[PDB]
Design an enzyme around this catalytic site. Structure first.
Site, PDB file in Angstrom:
ATOM      1  CG  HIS B 165     -59.128 138.085   2.075  1.00 23.31           C
ATOM      2  ND1 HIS B 165     -59.291 136.861   1.485  1.00 23.31           N
ATOM      3  CD2 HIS B 165     -60.342 138.775   1.893  1.00 23.31           C
ATOM      4  CE1 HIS B 165     -60.535 136.762   0.986  1.00 23.31           C
ATOM      5  NE2 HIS B 165     -61.185 137.932   1.235  1.00 23.31           N
ATOM      6  NE  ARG B 430     -51.604 132.581  15.851  1.00 26.56           N
ATOM      7  CZ  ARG B 430     -52.495 131.773  15.264  1.00 26.56           C
ATOM      8  NH1 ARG B 430     -53.401 131.116  15.956  1.00 26.56           N
ATOM      9  NH2 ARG B 430     -52.491 131.645  13.957  1.00 26.56           N
ATOM     10  CD  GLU B 540     -54.324 125.904  18.056  1.00 28.55           C
ATOM     11  OE1 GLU B 540     -54.727 125.290  17.045  1.00 28.55           O
ATOM     12  OE2 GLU B 540     -53.278 126.581  18.041  1.00 28.55           O
ATOM     13  CG  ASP B 577     -57.352 126.879  15.569  1.00 28.70           C
ATOM     14  OD1 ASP B 577     -57.220 126.795  14.340  1.00 28.70           O
ATOM     15  OD2 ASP B 577     -56.747 127.757  16.225  1.00 28.70           O
ATOM     16  NE  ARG B 615     -60.849 130.936  10.556  1.00 29.22           N
ATOM     17  CZ  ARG B 615     -61.493 131.373   9.471  1.00 29.22           C
ATOM     18  NH1 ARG B 615     -61.108 132.497   8.813  1.00 29.22           N
ATOM     19  NH2 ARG B 615     -62.529 130.653   9.044  1.00 29.22           N
ATOM     20  NE  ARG B 734     -51.573 127.751  10.350  1.00 28.87           N
ATOM     21  CZ  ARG B 734     -51.293 127.809  11.654  1.00 28.87           C
ATOM     22  NH1 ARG B 734     -50.463 126.946  12.216  1.00 28.87           N
ATOM     23  NH2 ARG B 734     -51.826 128.748  12.392  1.00 28.87           N
TER      24      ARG B 734
END
Ligand SMILES: N[C@@H](CC(=O)O)C(=O)O
Ligand SMILES: N[C@@H](CC(=O)O)C(=O)O
Lengths: 911, 911
Positions: B165, B430, B540, B577, B615, B734
């Site tokens: 979360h 990662r 990305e 991203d 995501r 980010r």
């Protein structure tokens, strides 16, 4: 299809297909699925055979053509031992299925909205008063204030004493399977098509799993564990659900507080491993073992729910608990790291958990090892130690503003703790008076002072009172001891050593005297028992009941005893036992009177009296009928404290399904409360007189058949599986085998015999008595309830089965004796019908009638199977042509065992 | 009364009060009970204050009068710190309540019986195809045989990867409370009056318990344990429920076997303690710990259900298991004495139990001690060892005729074992490419051979291939190591030491090269990892996506790599991203194309490709929309193997309620199966061209605002709580904080910016494009789903909140910049509406619209509270007149934290 089986079943039970009446449908569905299972497991032919037995048996029950019984006979004697076991297994399992279905029907049957208010309403689950309605009748009809009602309930005590199943304690595994079958059935009538398909397949699978749990006799320890299963299944949760409903009912009559969590309203007890009467397998070791087991299980139940309470008790907010938490600050499912101190309720409950674990482990080591090194401070030795930290959490939540949270799961747990204590059931010990006499006679002879046994009642009393204040112990090391005397003395050793919260009463079987009671008191003092068990006489024969008053009077006159008893005495009555001596009618009436008389004597002496109801009464039926049965009790025989036997054969009906569990607890509480404030009418003097006159006659008929007929015993041993059930004459036979043997034959002689002569004579002496009897039936709860139980027993009767057993098993010269008992049955039944105002058996309770009726075909098949099996066991030269094996080192005794268990499961309670 | 609150709520969401639409009622009921709780706990005045914030906020949402927002502002700035926390707590809790209510509504909303068959049906839970309906479309519409369908499902793989979360892993205790609130609500609409009164009081109590679980930041270990909670709550049981429904669906298309228990159809994985990208708190120790925790929990879950399976497995009837039982022949809840050998399945499962216990205990000691003496043979080290004895029970039941029993709980358990293995989730590691470069540069310099970092891409590849077949190890003891280089090398140490069934993929963040992938392969060989994790690049930026094809081509051209990869490669894409670099429109289209291109390259090289969906995609929405989102994927991008991110902020919606859990698992499986046999239409060439033209423009607008405007960063830091959420510029920020900061403002710039210019330019260049775009919307699943997600984001938008934040927090000279972004929002929204054929936001999904709408008043209150709180935090000289304390050492940062969590819980998923 399924439609076809439904139609078949409806021919036996036709008429009012309403919307909540699904019983026939349920049965159809189960039977349908089970017939498939039989095909899969045993082949089409066997399925067809089962179907044909069912059909033949249904037709016999429909029209009562005895040719049909003979056909079923032919079919069944032709089966080899192997086929025969499968058929017996199949029909027993069908019974268990019909019983699960029936429970589901009683669970969801619709309550009548408007009640007429006649006491008859309380005989029936659909009309009986719930706890709120009882409160309201007391407030509005008897002018009690809500506070007075509340106060009586607070001081009220209901104690249910669980006894062994007389034939077959259903094992824990199977009982759970029965539960899941029932649940799957429930859920099927809730539904998406795929859910139905899945439930359908899950039902199918559970029916099979049950059928194949079908594996010599069990240890009393194991019998005890099997008898405890219903706690886990329903009672454990049910107690708090019911206490919560009390809270709601109190609120709805204007009482603005919850029923206090530590009011000892509900208590459970047990005879399992405690009763050694006529049973030397129940040893001191067995008693010690079941006490440790009860202690083990209870701690284990608390332990295995404490982690859930700990999760839920996340709250971070009083200083009293704060302080305790700080002081306190691995191998478990949930909290296996150290609890942090910002989680204070969990620190407290974490300690309770550890203590519960240690309490459970000590009992386990004590049990399998012989001892444990685990110390008292690591463990709970008394119930207050467990309550204390829970009360602290309760108070802390209240003080921090979270009253509402406290009254959730924490309150539930508090109630469970208060109700079950450290031992789920307190154990009663029971042993017969003559064993105490023997023990004392050994002591007196060894002491050189004569023979207690030879002494008069006055001498016995005088010697017992002197030794109850003696300054020396009685028993030296050199006392010589038969095995029986040792077994009895070592029972007291066990009472001296185990904690007192393990035990309840020391019941004396076959009590007759003041001295019988004093004898046990002397043995308890001799063993220096810190908290002697209360001594409770069981007066069994009519003559014993008649001598009880003078016996209690004398006990209550003795300073030593009054002082010991501290204002309280319990006395036990056994309906089935007294009925064996005198016939059921005369035992019922005598028991009514005796209870009146002992209540009066108690009052006079300022002693509170508890009447402990042994088996065989109206009060042991379960369900609705138990509710009126309780309210029929003589005035002041309850007085705030009920103690009743829940008979093994009724436990499943009363507590197997959660709603029935709830309603059992509710009616016991509702009925007890009400009776103390609203006694049934007392009988008119004409009624007493007639009842006395009818008792003399009923006893004369019963005794002349059962004890004076020189060939009665011999007839009994042939017409009935009594002798085989083993695995003087009638006086010496115990009550359970007496009722059971005649119940296995569908004849029930012990329940109705004597009522025939009573009625016939009363009506012949004076025609006006018919009307008096009918008025008694409409107006006198005691009489109504007495007649109802017998009426329910006749609905389970079938004289054709008795006739068939006579043809196969009784010698020709006894057959007319049998025939004459059957004429007595018929005439007795008809007299009862005329008195009840009914054309048919049970027309006053058609839902019960339907339930019993759906069972008959199955029971009948087992009866026929049993009858020929007994022929084969009894006569190794009886043979017939066996069919080639139908199914796809096990004997005739095994088939008979299955037969006996099946019949008993369908017959449930009778006398 | 309650009627009054109901009426209030309906003013925001009016119209079609049908029978299964109870959402407003549910909300009314919860809000009503919670307002009482607030009165009890905090006083009438505080209740009235909460009510007034709600009202003001409702009126502002109804009519959008900015005077109303200003009033709510006045009220809220006047509250002291203490009152302010209570209000923030109250409105956050109201949100959690409205979410539980909404889940209940989605769980019981009625399915449409007849479906139109348009792909749009699959966007909506009420119309989407279930697994059976998917089977049938494939058989009847695509001419697959049922066997072909069955075979594809058998070989199919769906892997759901759970991520943290982004704001608040709900703790295990609270999540259970949320569950019970929801259940009590369900049960209230099932009902006797006393049951309702009791449920009513139980609801009340659970709402309070939740509210008072309201207690610095959490350890990743703890964050991991909180993220695992949904297994216990739903997924653990849900997997077998769903596999069973597969069985039923197979049966309904003519396949007469169950779906094999060991088909690896469902797999769960996790990033929790695995992802250390930009996060040095996720250390090697954390990784080791969450692997042991996952192992501990899984064994514990098996252990704590094995006793139930043992009870149920009472059966006494094959010789293979008979033999095993004989060979085998204390401190537990159930079977604490030795099992007898006439209970053979229990002997086997008894051993499985012990082994499970030992497996769980080893992990616990490994975790808290550092080591255990417990040996491998005492424990399960591989999943086959656990299956084996379970397969034996399965076979034994089948061979003895009990197939049907085997396919109950035993089959469920077999599936759980096959799905969850010994570690519930396999962990992905990662880390970013530059960290590997750093590690290798340290090695090369220390070896005296130059600087890896200075080397060209060709040199990097040449050196890596030579050392991947090197005969000496690279790393000597004297290698000097910065803390970062050590942390990265010691991660591989941990991979070398823990069992391979702990892990899944090694994802490389910021991948750009062939050499990035080879770098990680070299480090794994250097650590001698028996089973190296597969290496998965995450490309990305747009430029990285554009270079990916040449990078995969080169990898797949290298003998060493092809040989290592064994026909299989996974590549990861991150929508959020790529959208940060280029704007969401251009990232969507580029991602579509890149996936096409990499699929083609894989085919050419005979490599099976898995696309791992990070995501921010349409596919991460959950619910119905996820279903069409999946079927929109480019042809052959799934090909029997789905691997998708379940975003932390969506986990509760997807798996908190049992029906939603089931339906999540179902649509993931249904969609994966279908896509491989029924690809969406491929785009017309005019559509590609237009999409390319629109990408150039969308990227130019997005980049010119976000990267070239010199004061953008500065505006961002004032208008948004970005900086405070911490507890180069945008390129360096980010993705999660980027989406989150704008979601907290109700403005969502990152989701829609760029779509405005794309549309405006397309429509201005040629009027005919409007119609082309509309056709794309009606006909092209990719386009539809792309537009829908943005439409859902605008429904959560409120430019008035952004305006208010500007007034309070942005300096005057930046305010017009803010104003111009708001005009872009409006114009972008209107263009999207015109393309979607809608007058209002979400008129194509009115149930979603209602759900989002009921949340707004609560969210708005928190926004206003947040805005002034940030003013106070940012400016210690801002003050206003505080009201005297309303309620009955905690600061402004605490209020802000509550605010941020509340808004995020109401905003759920966006970009
Ligand atoms: N327990 C029932 C009888 C039965 O169901 O067998 C009754 O006494 O009325
Ligand atoms: N998960 C929902 C949005 C929400 O309920 O917040 C959707 O994407 O449609």
């Amino acid at each position: 299809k399924l439609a076809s089986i439904d139609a078949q079943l409806r021919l036996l039970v036709p008429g009012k297909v309403s919307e909540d009446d699904k019983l026939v449908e349920y049965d159809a569905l189960l039977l349908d699925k089970f017939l498939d299972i039989l095909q899969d497991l045993h082949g089409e032919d066997l399925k067809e055979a089962v179907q044909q037995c069912y059909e033949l048996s249904a037709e016999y029950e429909g029209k009562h053509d005895p040719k049909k019984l003979e056909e079923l006979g032919s079919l069944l004697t032709s089966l080899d031992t192997g086929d025969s076991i499968v058929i017996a297994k199949a029909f027993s399992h069908m019974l268990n299925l019909a019983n699960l279905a029936e429970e589901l029907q009683i669970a969801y049957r619709r309550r009548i909205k408007l009640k007429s208010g006649d006491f008859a309403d309380e005989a029936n689950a659909t009309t009986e008063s719930d706890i709120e309605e009882t409160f309201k009748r007391l407030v509005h009809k008897l002018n009690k204030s809500p506070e007075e009602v509340f106060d009586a309930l607070k001081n009220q005590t209901v104690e249910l004493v669980l006894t062994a199943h007389p034939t077959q304690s259903v094992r824990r595994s199977l009982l759970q399977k029965h539960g899941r079958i029932r649940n799957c059935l429930a859920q099927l009538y809730a539904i998406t098509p795929d859910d139905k398909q899945e439930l359908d397949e899950a039902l199918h699978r559970e029916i099979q799993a049950a059928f194949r749990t079908d594996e010599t006799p069990p240890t009393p320890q194991d019998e005890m564990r099997a008898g405890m299963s219903y706690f886990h299944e329903t009672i454990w949760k049910g107690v708090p659900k019911f206490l919560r409903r009390v809270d709601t009912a109190l609120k709805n009559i204007g009482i603005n507080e919850r029923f206090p969590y530590n009011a000892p309203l509900i208590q459970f007890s047990s005879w399992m491993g405690g009763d050694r009467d006529g049973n030397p397998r129940v040893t001191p070791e067995v008693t010690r073992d079941v006490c440790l087991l009860a202690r083990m299980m209870t701690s284990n139940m608390y332990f295995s729910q404490i982690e859930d309470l700990m999760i839920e008790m996340s709250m971070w907010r009083n200083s009293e608990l704060r302080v305790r938490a700080e002081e306190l600050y691995k191998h478990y499912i949930e909290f296996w790291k150290r609890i942090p101190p910002n989680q204070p309720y969990r620190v407290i409950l974490g300690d309770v958990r550890d203590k519960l674990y240690n309490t459970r482990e000590r009992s386990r080591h004590l049990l399998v090892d012989g001892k444990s090194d685990i110390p008292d401070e690591a463990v709970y030795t008394n119930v207050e130690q467990l309550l204390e930290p829970l009360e602290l959490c309760y108070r802390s939540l209240c003080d921090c503003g979270d009253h509402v949270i406290a009254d959730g799961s924490l309150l539930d747990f508090l109630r469970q703790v208060s109700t079950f204590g450290l031992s789920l059931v307190k154990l009663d010990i029971r042993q017969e008076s003559d064993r105490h006499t023997e023990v004392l006679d050994a002591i007196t002879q060894h002491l050189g002072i004569g023979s207690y046994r030879e002494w008069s009642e006055e001498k016995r009393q005088e010697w017992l009172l002197a030794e109850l204040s003696g300054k020396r112990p009685l028993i030296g090391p050199d006392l010589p001891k038969t095995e029986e005397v040792k077994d009895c003395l070592d029972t007291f050793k066990v009472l001296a050593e185990l904690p007192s919260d393990c035990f309840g009463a020391y019941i004396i079987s076959m009590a007759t005297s003041t001295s019988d009671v004093l004898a046990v008191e002397l043995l308890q003092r001799e063993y220096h028992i810190k908290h002697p068990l209360r001594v409770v006489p069981l007066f069994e024969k009519l003559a014993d009941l008649e001598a009880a008053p003078a016996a209690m009077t004398r006990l209550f006159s003795m300073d030593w005893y009054r002082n010991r008893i501290d204002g309280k005495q319990e006395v036990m009555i056994g309906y089935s036992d007294s009925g064996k001596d005198a016939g059921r009618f005369s035992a019922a009436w005598q028991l009514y009177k005796t209870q009146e008389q002992i209540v009066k004597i108690a009052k006079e002496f300022g002693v509170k009296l508890v009447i402990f109801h042994g088996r065989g009464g109206t009060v042991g039926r379960g369900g609705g009928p138990t509710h009126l049965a309780l309210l029929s009790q003589p005035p002041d025989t309850i007085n705030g404290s009920l103690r009743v036997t829940v008979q093994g054969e009724v436990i499943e009906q009363s507590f197997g399904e959660e709603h029935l569990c709830f309603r059992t607890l509710q009616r016991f509480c509702a009925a007890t409360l009400e009776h103390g404030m609203n006694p049934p009418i007392s009988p008119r003097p004409e009624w007493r007189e007639l009842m006395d006159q009818m008792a003399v006659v009923a006893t004369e008929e019963y005794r002349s058949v059962v004890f004076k007929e020189p060939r009665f015993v011999e007839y009994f041993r042939l017409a009935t599986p009594e002798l085989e059930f083993g695995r003087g004459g009638i006086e010496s036979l115990r009550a359970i085998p007496w009722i059971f043997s005649w119940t296995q034959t569908r004849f029930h002689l012990p329940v109705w015999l004597g009522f025939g002569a009573a009625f016939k004579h009363a009506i012949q002496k004076d025609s006006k008595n018919l009307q008096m009897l009918q008025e008694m039936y409409k107006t006198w709860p005691f009489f109504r309830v007495t007649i109802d139980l017998v009426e329910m027993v006749f609905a389970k009767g079938n004289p054709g089965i008795a006739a068939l057993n006579d043809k196969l098993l009784v010698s020709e010269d006894l057959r007319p004796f049998g025939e004459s008992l059957r004429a007595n049955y018929e005439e007795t039944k008809n007299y009862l019908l005329k008195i009840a105002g009914h054309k048919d058996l049970l027309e006053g309770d058609p839902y019960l009638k339907q339930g019993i009726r759906l069972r008959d075909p199955y029971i009948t098949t087992l009866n026929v199977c049993q009858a020929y099996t007994l022929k084969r066991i009894r006569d190794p030269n009886y043979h017939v042509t066996l069919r080639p094996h139908i199914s796809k080192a096990p004997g005739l005794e095994d088939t008979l065992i299955l037969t006996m268990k099946g019949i008993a499961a369908g017959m449930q309670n009778t006398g």
